[PDB]
Amino acid sequence: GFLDGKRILLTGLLSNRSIAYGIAKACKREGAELAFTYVGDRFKDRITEFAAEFGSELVFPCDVADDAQIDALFASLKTHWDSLDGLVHSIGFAPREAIAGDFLDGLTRENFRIAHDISAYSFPALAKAALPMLSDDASLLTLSYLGAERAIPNYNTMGLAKAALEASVRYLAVSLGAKGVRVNAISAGPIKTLAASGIKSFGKILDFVESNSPLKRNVTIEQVGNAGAFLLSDLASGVTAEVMHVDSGFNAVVGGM
Amino acid sequence: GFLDGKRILLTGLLSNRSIAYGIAKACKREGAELAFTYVGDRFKDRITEFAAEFGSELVFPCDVADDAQIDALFASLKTHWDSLDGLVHSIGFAPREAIAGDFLDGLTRENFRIAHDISAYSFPALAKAALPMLSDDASLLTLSYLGAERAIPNYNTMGLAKAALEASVRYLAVSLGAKGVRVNAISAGPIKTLAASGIKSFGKILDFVESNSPLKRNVTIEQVGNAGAFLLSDLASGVTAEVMHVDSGFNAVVGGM
Amino acid sequence: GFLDGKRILLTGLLSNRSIAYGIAKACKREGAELAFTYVGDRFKDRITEFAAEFGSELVFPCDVADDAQIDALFASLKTHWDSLDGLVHSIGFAPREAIAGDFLDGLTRENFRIAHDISAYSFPALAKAALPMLSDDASLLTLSYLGAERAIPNYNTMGLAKAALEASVRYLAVSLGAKGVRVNAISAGPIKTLAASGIKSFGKILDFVESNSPLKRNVTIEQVGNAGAFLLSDLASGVTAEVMHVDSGFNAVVGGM
Amino acid sequence: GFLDGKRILLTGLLSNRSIAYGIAKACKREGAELAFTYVGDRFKDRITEFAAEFGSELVFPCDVADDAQIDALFASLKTHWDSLDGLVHSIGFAPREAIAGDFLDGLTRENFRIAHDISAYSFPALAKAALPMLSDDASLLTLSYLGAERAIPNYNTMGLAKAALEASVRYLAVSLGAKGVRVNAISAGPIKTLAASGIKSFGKILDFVESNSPLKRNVTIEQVGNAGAFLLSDLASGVTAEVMHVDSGFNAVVGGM
Ligand SMILES: NC(=O)c1ccc[n+]([C@@H]2O[C@H](COP(=O)([O-])OP(=O)(O)OC[C@H]3O[C@@H](n4cnc5c(N)ncnc54)[C@H](O)[C@@H]3O)[C@@H](O)[C@H]2O)c1
Ligand SMILES: NC(=O)c1ccc[n+]([C@@H]2O[C@H](COP(=O)([O-])OP(=O)(O)OC[C@H]3O[C@@H](n4cnc5c(N)ncnc54)[C@H](O)[C@@H]3O)[C@@H](O)[C@H]2O)c1
Ligand SMILES: NC(=O)c1ccc[n+]([C@@H]2O[C@H](COP(=O)([O-])OP(=O)(O)OC[C@H]3O[C@@H](n4cnc5c(N)ncnc54)[C@H](O)[C@@H]3O)[C@@H](O)[C@H]2O)c1
Ligand SMILES: NC(=O)c1ccc[n+]([C@@H]2O[C@H](COP(=O)([O-])OP(=O)(O)OC[C@H]3O[C@@H](n4cnc5c(N)ncnc54)[C@H](O)[C@@H]3O)[C@@H](O)[C@H]2O)c1
Ligand SMILES: CCCCCCc1cc(O)c(Oc2ccccc2C)cc1F
Ligand SMILES: CCCCCCc1cc(O)c(Oc2ccccc2C)cc1F
Ligand SMILES: CCCCCCc1cc(O)c(Oc2ccccc2C)cc1F
Ligand SMILES: CCCCCCc1cc(O)c(Oc2ccccc2C)cc1F
């Protein structure tokens, strides 16, 4: 397959509906060797099973709020892999009130700080910590959403954090590019994941995308997974600093009128 | 003039080269009544003189790192003005290392936090605190830079923060818009201000814009000031959620080849 | 006013609902001297009355399909004005079928040709013909619509032509910029004009913008007019190659969900 | 491979440096069956050899200036293939003067017409003619350049045509999407092809991209080819109406300062 030999670390594989699961499944199909992170000792068994499904026993704890855990992740990974070819950042968080209702009602300094710390900062932070072991042709991928580009109801503080995240893709691409490393994002359409059980204006958004997207259907984690596998692969060696929409074309229309 | 009767609070007027000074001068010319903020007791005399130049004695301290000072600013302003028609956010900061050299070398969690706190969060934070006294036709303006949209050498962490800031313009526009309040940014070209004495890759950027911009010249604080006055005025009542480039058209070209 | 002394030629003033009428009214208020074009001998009396309303008797025929008429327009204007400070291009056309229903059903080579000839080519063609008499600080303005940027139902072939038009703003800005001339567009929201009595999916779009735009209201020709006057004026001397949205912020949201 | 069974028609394969050749080579590797167009009887032998290199004897004449040839192309193809799964539009032309020097000097109505007819109109025209035989999961791909988005010296009239072309990608995506057909573009970086021997400001642009792109290298037809194969494949079933940059990240920076 087109990822034969590539060794890829995936964050954010929480359930079999996680975007990271679709990415994991596609990467495994195309021949990659995988390793996985988790947060909280209670998910250790679950992530261990997922890893074994993908022929892997490489699982490591990493709460990205913690500098020591970020450093320890790569120290641990390095005892198995002398080099890293891929990194999937599929991590996000904002306090409930900061992604519900009116943008200002949910705005506080702490809510802003946490959302940007976990959803934006953590991507280049992982990149920096991984750098000494990145292969020259490594590829780093993060996940964003159209709320970074345009105001979408309820997305609120997460829209700000995703905008910073997309900017980080561009600055990372420049920092790491002379070495040969690529950095991209996928702007994925709505998919019913665990994170989506935050606000269900989600049902409304899901219906709207199905009705108004050019393909008249919502995307799947298989479709996002395949796009992800592509970006992580040498097939995409000409592509960096890109935010690729995998959203049935929804971003490109004015819908609903 | 086209701002007759409008009462406008300006942050960030540090010296007579400040972008806020150009905005202040243009607003005053067009008939606005002005008030000003400052940071640190040592600038109290200087900002007091600027205010008097613009026919004003309304000066208030406000370090935007401090919730109590943000709240106290509007409590103080309210003892003079029962309503606020305009707000100019012309504030930014990142630690020196976070806007010099390689993006990852200057990246730390604290540097990221501070840059986003001061340069991005503070805009909607001031908006929220001002809201109870905003007039229905009020207009809020912030200042951004092309580094939000594309990777520019040295801008680094500030590029991420400005991207979040531009997103905040869109979410603020939605939150405040049903009331009638407008929220916009100007993406200004390089201008030799006190903030510009950070990294002088500035001389290089300044030369490059002069050589490659469509108008073959750098912008002035008078030009940014006039665009600002326009946005704060009822002339711009159809315009909100916009990031307007005032940069001699530089953003629209691929230059230097 | 801020256009005192400026001499501005306006195309496209067809009725008192025309966007050009709002622009004309705003320019006249701010002190400009106006001249006007028309198409077809039957509109000569009507445009003559409009011109007199704005203190002008300067009216000239110009079908932009015709090279000879474009050249003759400026020869005629030059017998009155030795220089031209402003040009408003507020002209568009596509055959009915090319802006109704399915994009491919209405697509023919001739429909494509006509739409691009009249709606896109004519802007830089007028600029080129005007160039020998343009003042160094002249300002050229055209009108576009969000359908250039994103696919909007029914807009179809006009979306392609407006995309080419917006590109022409950028290339014109470079060509004319070293002289000092500025070139911009306003991307206006829907306004019930004569052109809007093409397809009334217009009623639907109008309702959708009112319901979903940040300001929760449609724009007016007064609002587009004032933005236009600003762009044509020295207030906007820092602004070129820009496509400014005057659409109540509608472009910046994902609405309707 | 990931295009096994897919039947793909490629236009624009002129020499072994053509972007279409890289696309052809990648599609063939991934298992596609190919057919090819050519213009002018003198290239019949050359295109016949290329086709045989890719295991094909399916070659057809098609000058896209001619409606009858467009219709005859698909009538001919249909005698071999009852369905079409992919279409690569890798065609462009503007008269020499319209892509050299100053934008207005090279601007004429005929130059504008020809550039838009051949470089923009021809894409949806081929789509419309192919439609009756397109498979439900078909994928249509065109090639664009950054000059559509920003003004690049010399690109001039072709910048306008590529902007219209990118808009056509969005309108085509909507028209064909309910059926299930996808439509995308690749915005490729400079590559030394036969078309590039127009103006050699090309050497300058090539050097500039190598020096300033994040990956510090120019793209290859292999890299554009692989991205193309991806877009034409079911791996990209979630992706439509997209303009994907394959340009070493050059679009995402401000370079050269
Ligand atoms: N589901 C969608 O509709 C959608 C659309 C566009 C983008 N995205 C993005 O895709 C990414 C994945 O989300 P998802 O949809 O797969 O939902 P998910 O719940 O399956 O994945 C979210 C992950 O974030 C991880 N996470 C949260 N806080 C963390 C921390 N402090 N340290 C480490 N990990 C942490 C969680 O463990 C979880 O694995 C997110 O960035 C999300 O923003 C999702
Ligand atoms: N000068 C340029 O080239 C340029 C270009 C584009 C955008 N901008 C932006 O314009 C805005 C104004 O900068 P400037 O160029 O006028 O330089 P400046 O130094 O004159 O203004 C910066 C202001 O930020 C204020 N500030 C910093 N920390 C603060 C805090 N904690 N609380 C309150 N105020 C604080 C300073 O007091 C100062 O008044 C900034 O947002 C800047 O990012 C500047
Ligand atoms: N009305 C809207 O909702 C809206 C929104 C965005 C942009 N626009 C654009 O604003 C501009 C003005 O349109 P409008 O809304 O004021 O409607 P309008 O009917 O009042 O103006 C259209 C003008 O195009 C002129 N025109 C058509 N063919 C011509 C030719 N061959 N030569 C010279 N002039 C010709 C007509 O004479 C008419 O004056 C157009 O470019 C339009 O695309 C309109
Ligand atoms: N080479 C680059 O740097 C570059 C960069 C970005 C985009 N592009 C685009 O990629 C596409 C392919 O160009 P290329 O670089 O492979 O150069 P090329 O010369 O190899 O391909 C151009 C093709 O256009 C075809 N063509 C011209 N007129 C035609 C007509 N009337 N009917 C049918 N075909 C016609 C030619 O036959 C030729 O095959 C073009 O659209 C071009 O604009 C090229
Ligand atoms: C807000 C209306 C539409 C949002 C749907 C798309 C979407 C985007 C996401 O970034 C997403 O993941 C998160 C959302 C909020 C907080 C944390 C995460 C991981 C989940 C999700 F369903
Ligand atoms: C990094 C190369 C080009 C940057 C020049 C434009 C510019 C943009 C700015 O946002 C600016 O103001 C700051 C920059 C860094 C940190 C804080 C501020 C206020 C100053 C400034 F000169
Ligand atoms: C297609 C749905 C929304 C379109 C509304 C906005 C609009 C945009 C326009 O560019 C416009 O003017 C024309 C439209 C088609 C053909 C010719 C013109 C001048 C009129 C008009 F009402
Ligand atoms: C104008 C300066 C940079 C242009 C380089 C990239 C490029 C873009 C193209 O679209 C291209 O193909 C054509 C260019 C002009 C006319 C016709 C074609 C096919 C060739 C080409 F080298």
Side-chain angles (χ1 to χ4, degrees), chain C residues 62-76:
Chain C
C62 187
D63 181 346
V64 296
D66 192 334
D67 289 354
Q69 292 190 38
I70 291 176
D71 292 341
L73 165 56
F74 294 100
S76 292

Side-chain angles (χ1 to χ4, degrees), chain A residues 95-112 156-157, chain B residues 128:
Chain A
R96 175 180 60 260
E97 61 166 344
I99 49 177
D102 173 77
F103 168 68
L104 287 180
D105 289 343
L107 180 77
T108 68
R109 192 183 306 268
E110 187 68 3
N111 287 353
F112 175 96
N156 301 348
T157 295
Chain B
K128 183 175 185 179

Side-chain angles (χ1 to χ4, degrees), chain B residues 12-14 18-20 39 62-65 90-93 118 143-145 155 162 188-191 193-195 202:
Chain B
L13 203 172
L14 191 57
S18 286
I19 283 176
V39 202
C62 187
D63 181 346
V64 296
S90 199
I91 290 178
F93 178 81
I118 305 302
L143 274 298
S144 188
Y145 177 61
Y155 206 60
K162 291 298 194 185
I191 300 174
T193 63
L194 280 171
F202 191 79

